[PDB]
Amino acid sequence: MNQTLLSSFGTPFERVENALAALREGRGVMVLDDEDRENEGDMIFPAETMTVEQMALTIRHGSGIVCLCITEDRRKQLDLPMMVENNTSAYGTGFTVTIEAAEGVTTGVSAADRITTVRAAIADGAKPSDLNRPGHVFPLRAQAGGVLTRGGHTEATIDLMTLAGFKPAGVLCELTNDDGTMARAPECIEFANKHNMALVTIEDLVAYRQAHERKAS
C-alpha cells in the first residue's frame, strides 16, 4: 500500500518537498485540516487534467466532488462572476457557481469520457463562454499564495496546487461516498487513500508553500 507517501513521509518542508514531486504526478495526495466543514482532500489534482487516478479511488469508495481552485485571474480570464447572493436561501455561501466544459464535456461524473474532454475543455485558455454550468465543477475564488492569511483551506485551494508544484487550478476532495458516510479524521480518509493515495494536512502543508517561495534578497 502506498499510504506512507505523505503519512510517515509528509512534513511540510522535509517530506512534502520530496513528496511534492511524488504526488506532483497525481500519485495521490490528500490534505486534512482541523475544522467542521469537509471537502478538500485526497483529490488535490490539477483543475485542467482531472485524471482518473482519483476517479478510480472515487468509483469504489468516493465521489466526484472536488474543490476547484480558481484565482481572481483564473475566473477573470473565464470572465464569469456568478457570485451566489441568495439572500436567506444561502447564508452568504458566496458559492462561486460552477462552470461546465462546453468544449466537449457534458456529464459532470464521467471520469473516463470526461477527463478526456475536460482535459481539453476546462483547460482551454480562454473560456469566458466555453464553461457554462451547472457543470459539477465548483471553483472557489482563493487568493494565490495567500492561503496563510486564512483560517480556512479555501484560499488553500488555489494555493493547494501552488503548494503542490501545480498552476493554481486544482481539485481537492475527501472520502465522499454515496452511503452518507461522514468521513472524518485522517484514519477514515486513510482507508481510501492508504491503498491508492498519499495523505497530508493543510495547516503545516500551507506553511510549507511560503517556505518554498521565501526570498532572501
Swiss-Prot record:
EC number: 4.1.99.12
Effect annotated for changing H136S: Loss of activity
Site note Essential for catalytic activity, residues: H136, E174
Cofactor(s) named in the record: Mg(2+); Mn(2+)
Main location: membrane
Induction (UniProt): Is expressed at all temperatures, but accumulation of transcripts decline with raising temperature. Thus, its expression is repressed by heat shock.
GO cellular component: cytosol; plasma membrane
Substitution effect: E174S: Loss of activity
NCBIfam families (UniProt xref): ribB
Known partners and oligomeric status: Homodimer.
Protein name: 3,4-dihydroxy-2-butanone 4-phosphate synthase
Source organism per UniProt: Escherichia coli (strain K12)
Gene: ribB
